């Protein structure tokens with residue numbers, strides 16, 4: 130028992146991280162087979178970070194303008210192209226550490242692990258969710274761009290995120306591995322801002338089930354609610370709506386604990402109207418919304434990866 | 436910016452994990468050079484989990500009673516010995532993936548990353564602290580014993596924890612890698628219990644400095660306090676005492692933010708007496724005590740490992 134913010138083991142991804150230098154900018158790249166992926170703003174100059182023309186900027190580069198370091202071994206670039214907001218650097222060596230992988234794009238509400246890197250060297254791993262407003266509440270400093278987010282399914286790494294920028298509230302924006310931004314953000318230094326977020330309702334319910342599995346029951350009650358009546362309360366507390374599909378996804382957790390989903394909704398309803406009154410759930414004094422129903426089952430049931 | 440519960444990259448440790456079977460018990464072992472380390476209760480039988488005699492139990496075993504699987508490759512045991520509460524299984528192959536390493540024992544208040552494993556296969560990574568009562572608030576299920584806790588310093592893994600058991604409040608107890616338990620716990624199924632914990636004061640202060648670095652300032656105040664007067668307030672809230680050495684360790688964070696340590700103590704004092712009044716710090720509604728001053732500097736300054 131116990132419940133922790135759990136990331137995937139990072140070893141398969143660590144063996145893909147490299148350092149990409151263009152001019153005086155150094156950031157991280159992801160080396161899979163004979164291609165290195167990195168944020169295209171690596172080619173941006175200090176003179177015009179405000180409104181670059183990346184097509185123009187890239188046509189002025191040669192292969193030799195990209196220094197790629199895999200550890201203490203330099204990789205020769207033999208081709209380059211732009212795909213949306215990422216650069217694809219063709220190199221003359223396939224990464225022998227290439228895992229089985231996919232490029233997948235995730236939905237707001239889903240979670241992933243981030244391997245933060247500087248100078249091609251992994252610094253730390255942590256778990257994030259895609260917020261409803263398409264930001265992620267990350268932990269990133271200068272030089273972290275090109276760090277990736279990922280999920281693991283048995284032996285296969287599903288890459289879902291590459292880091293590109295930090296917004297003025299301290300949250301982060303980036304792309305999928307095809308270079309397409311999550312949300313309405315661009316890789317220029319404009320006045321963009323996150324815009325209003327909501328709480329991921331289905332995930333809070335998942336985490337309440339985790340608490341019950343782990344012996345926190347104090348927030349349970351004998352009441353129930355209709356889905357419609359629950360959602361009227363959710364709207365007022367800036368929670369997002371719960372759907373019948375969310376109820377279906379919570380089925381296994383409902384069956385394990387014996388607590389009907391709509392009964393748990395009635396408990397969440399009372400938590401929202403009354404607060405927690407000096408008590409905690411799973412060591413938190415807030416309702417936690419960055420665990421999916423999958424995350425809870427995995428952690429409380431013990432799935433591994435190989 | 437941003438602040439996350441950050442674990443170390445786990446790849447160096449993933450390459451050391453193996454599966455150890457004796458009888459009908461399977462758990463995890465740590466393979467370094469030609470030795471596999473695992474919890475000695477792997478040899479315990481179901482008949483007498485209550486009060487085993489491990490010397491007696493081990494003298495009745497042969498090398499061939501230990502099945503060790505490194506992935507899908509079986510390792511031949513060529514010797515075995517007991518060191519305190521761990522078993523040292525000598526095998527006929529050195530782990531070619533052995534990192535530079537040390538066996539270190541940590542202090543309550545210090546943090547480490549845990550690579551949870553089942554059947555020799557890594558499941559997830561998360562960050563823990565050694566509690567003042569020598570438990571850790573982990574996340575562990577059946578078969579997780581032999582998972583290790585560790586810190587990384589450049590290229591060198593400092594192993595500090597091996598998992599052995601779960602106590603009745605859902606917290607966890609284990610040994611250092613020499614087999615010596617943290618705290619007053621034994622590897623028998625008796626009625627042992629955690630005993631009362633305290634909050635790690637210096638770590639809360641570190642995390643308040645992290646918040647200021649990240650732009651949360653609302654809890655600051657114009658007041659100050661003496662160390663003695665602060666500790667009178669700490670005792671009453673079950674915080675542990677703050678020492679001049681703790682004040683010295685917080686020096687760098689004090690200098691970066693311009694907030695004197697004792698000034699931050701006055702802010703913590705008011706937080707303890709008034710609560711947080713519906714506000715949050717670094718996304719938490721509780722005072723967080725599982726980040727050390729080192730953790731904060733590392734995350735807010737960007738140290739890597741290679």
Ligand SMILES: *[C@H](N)[C@H](C[C@@H]1CCNC1=O)NC(=O)[C@@H]1CC2(CCCCC2)CN1C(=O)[C@@H](NC(=O)C(F)(F)F)C(C)(C)C
Pocket residue numbers: 156170173178269270271272273274275292293294295296297301316317318319320321436
């Ligand atoms: C990548 N190494 C870096 C990550 C970033 C530094 C601080 N914390 C982080 O997560 N990305 C950047 O510095 C990008 C690159 C930039 C925009 C594209 C053109 C070249 C310069 C500036 N930048 C930023 O993240 C900006 N943020 C913005 O422009 C935004 F607010 F999003 F519009 C700054 C202000 C430097 C954080």
Ligand SMILES: *[C@H](N)[C@H](C[C@@H]1CCNC1=O)NC(=O)[C@@H]1CC2(CCCCC2)CN1C(=O)[C@@H](NC(=O)C(F)(F)F)C(C)(C)C
Pocket residue numbers: 130462476479484575576577578579580581598599600601602603607622623624625626627
């Ligand atoms: C290791 N695979 C396992 C980890 C544990 C299972 C559930 N969550 C966990 O962290 N360890 C055990 O099962 C140990 C082994 C045990 C004690 C030594 C002799 C052989 C049997 C039983 N055990 C336990 O953790 C106990 N706990 C206790 O005995 C304690 F409370 F600590 F005294 C049980 C009750 C099974 C959790």
